[PDB]
Amino acid sequence: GTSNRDWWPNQLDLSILHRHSSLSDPMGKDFNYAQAFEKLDLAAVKRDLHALMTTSQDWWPADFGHYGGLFIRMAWHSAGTYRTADGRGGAGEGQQRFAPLNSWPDNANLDKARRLLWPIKQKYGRAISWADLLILTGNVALESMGFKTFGFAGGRADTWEPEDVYWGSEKIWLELSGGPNSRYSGDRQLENPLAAVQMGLIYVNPEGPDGNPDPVAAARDIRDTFARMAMNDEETVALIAGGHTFGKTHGAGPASNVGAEPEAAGIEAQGLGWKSAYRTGKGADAITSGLEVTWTTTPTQWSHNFFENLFGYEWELTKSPAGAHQWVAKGADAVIPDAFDPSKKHRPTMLTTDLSLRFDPAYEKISRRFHENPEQFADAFARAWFKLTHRDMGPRARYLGPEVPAEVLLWQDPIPAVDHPLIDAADAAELKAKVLASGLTVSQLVSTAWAAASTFRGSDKRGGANGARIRLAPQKDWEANQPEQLAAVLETLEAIRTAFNGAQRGGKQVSLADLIVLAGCAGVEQAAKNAGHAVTVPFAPGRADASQEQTDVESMAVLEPVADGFRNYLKGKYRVPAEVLLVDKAQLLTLSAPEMTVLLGGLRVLGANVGQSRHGVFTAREQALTNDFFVNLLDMGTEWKPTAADADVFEGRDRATGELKWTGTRVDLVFGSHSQLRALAEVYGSADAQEKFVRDFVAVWNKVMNLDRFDLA
Template structure:
């Protein structure tokens, strides 16, 4: 609405006086209600019958030439030009006896004048049934886009058609038995893949999950497809090596009566790597594994849509794609939040993964241990060691050296995503717990719990 100039309109809800009770946008123009309302400043309707589904919008858009005018509030809008035929008037929103000229905004006219959108709009105008179908599909996508895959849908009205924006994944054809799992674990151990390669690949696959719209995750093994297999953060050369090894194991296992998906093998590989790293540190653990993932095809993967999932930063792998206004530690917290991790879960995962050499570029930044490749709490012990002093070694203050306080000998190098666990008071409190001499068993248990949570973030078939 735009009944009068915006000078009559009050402040926004958060800026209004306390006695206005956040109603905001209050107007001192006449009654301030109904015909006297001021909101966007635009005044009028687009069609002759605004409450009826018809082609009135396109009829008006293409049926008239339009000229620029202003609403009573002074907002720019367009009205039909008198060019030889009657103009169908639109009903007033508040006075039944009153009729108004239809109006359009500049964005509306772009659907007519733009060289790309114009032909699309004309096609819809000439083919009402096609327009109705396209609108229904677009509306369904708009209102269901953040619900995740079809596994999250309930009720009898779920369409049978599978749509590519739902990120379809074929169901697993065979349920792995415990004996199968142990056989596959043995084959992975003998594959020659390192702890770092196995753990990094599993993390890269699962950590794409976004709790905001339930997209991404390990199910589907789309890390072996475009665009994910080419992302810099995934170290494409190393990733290709791991996938080829796992495909070889898959080929040797699959038969007419049984099969395993690459998606399951990737996650199982991460479990094998962690168990191997714990054993090397003198601890015997078992990482929970729940099979049942499927493998998506390239045809089932919208490359453009999945490109939007590429992380601009992943502090768990000490990766930042470029220079941003946000700091590395802020982006780390944002990434953890997308994966629905708590602060303690984020903390223990960082500590464990640093020791397992999961940096995207295989650098030693944040690897505060002499026992690399083993699952230990050394990251926390050495980060909080008071015998170490830290100093920035880059002008951007994103890389630091830790030196022995007495000898000045360089001991470690770390990034902001590492040092934040000693700098931030809350994160330091968690780090101090895991740095304790008697916390090794707690560290292992918490790390495995958080790891398993990430691996199963997209397993909606297990929820409930």
């Protein structure tokens, strides 16, 4: 069946902006997951999950009689696809149940784990999503086995189709580095935005880098991949040691026994995969990773035995029954219990990646401290497990149910509670007039508010204008934000705010976060008036100002835009074409193709480009809100060519005279090239479309201003 993707594999794919339509969603347009979850009897759900832990099913018998380890690994993998670079992956959409993650090699047999949860899912129905259930089940596993969690928030709404995520370019599962589509270059540099060492792994290879069983080298990969999942050294050691306090791995026989992954299995397998011809195919004969390691003397109970073993023995390199590299404790007694046979015991074993916690010098010091102070280990793991499993849930206002921790954590980019009356519509009109009387231009007001709001990404629900973090390090210094002009605009807004707030009775005040947005609205109003349209822009108050100490500077670096097509900004020269980067950004902002089109066309004419660039400013009435961008872009009286100096900048000349009319980047011209985008630009560039352009612009502007406003949801 030959498709457009086969004929034109490097054309832009806009379908990624149109996933998650109401067409694929089986719930009404009215279904609100938060409200269904708020009625769930969470306690009853936890009781059922507690019972499930030791209700072994014959089609996938429970190791040691307890599914706890399996469910902790299930939950860890649901969370563990998260990348800080784009905020994609993570547990927040329940994507583990869809392709490709349902069939990743590292997710082998987690199909069985999710099938075990079906009766509970079915019983509670829409009131608990798969996405919430997977994490809750991890929590309950930990609790069942004697570990007290830091807490749990519901509110991860289920999704209904696979996300479009760049997981790499390799065409072979688990391909080792240096192939034709290598994710590594230079001195083992992993390409952004990837956060795993091989296609179909979560973070690293348990045998060591590219299969080489060097724990020191393995530590380097661990540290890099975990940093790319937002975890520092302490959190990392706590998570790995904490997780490998429980359960075991499965490699009872050769991996050639294991058949097709779920998405490749036959229809009779009913959504399950990795069927094994080794012996009974399950239980004591299970093959998952190929490794055969049990870490502790009590695999179904919280202990301090991980670090006791890690430091208490010396380790020797050996092989699992499947042929995989792993480590066995030299001269040890058989103290580890067998998962199925009460008469067999085994020597302590470890993976290469466990030994990393000992033999990397920085990890070693943390592992020692946790060894000597187990209460610090327990607390670090609890905190890290909460972080891991909630990292992509967004602001605290989205957290539901009775187990939400009251402690506010730095990584949540917290926003202070509003404790005063908010501005009303009269106050908003007075502020907007003061803004316009101060001398700030349309371009300044629009650029500033765009800069503040457009850090939001729906992937992990970080960023947005709430908080006024654009006035703090590091946002205030980002090149795309034009630090010098930004400083000037903020100093003017701050004087307006000080004066308005000092005039108030009764505790009313306006936050700078609100005023930045409100000021951008005034700029759009002014621009509409410059074009002869009478427009009021909607504005919702209630944003607050976060302090510098509430803003982790390092964590904030990943939100820096290195490409923002909306401002015609590229930080350097990338191997990814700019128009691909524009679509990627539109996706993070939750924009459809029509929204992205109208938005960019308006921003160009309002003066939002970085550095006052003229590229794509296809108008003679800059700072007026018109559809000029489109009308001029589509004018066949102009011919375009890439410039001598740069293949990425284009000159548009009068076809008859050869005179230069405009210049543009690939981001500008793509709207006139791509057949679906051009169809959109046409709508907005038609003679009957001036009002529609202004109205659709206002609506999309307001949408971007409100992206993070979960306090109103």
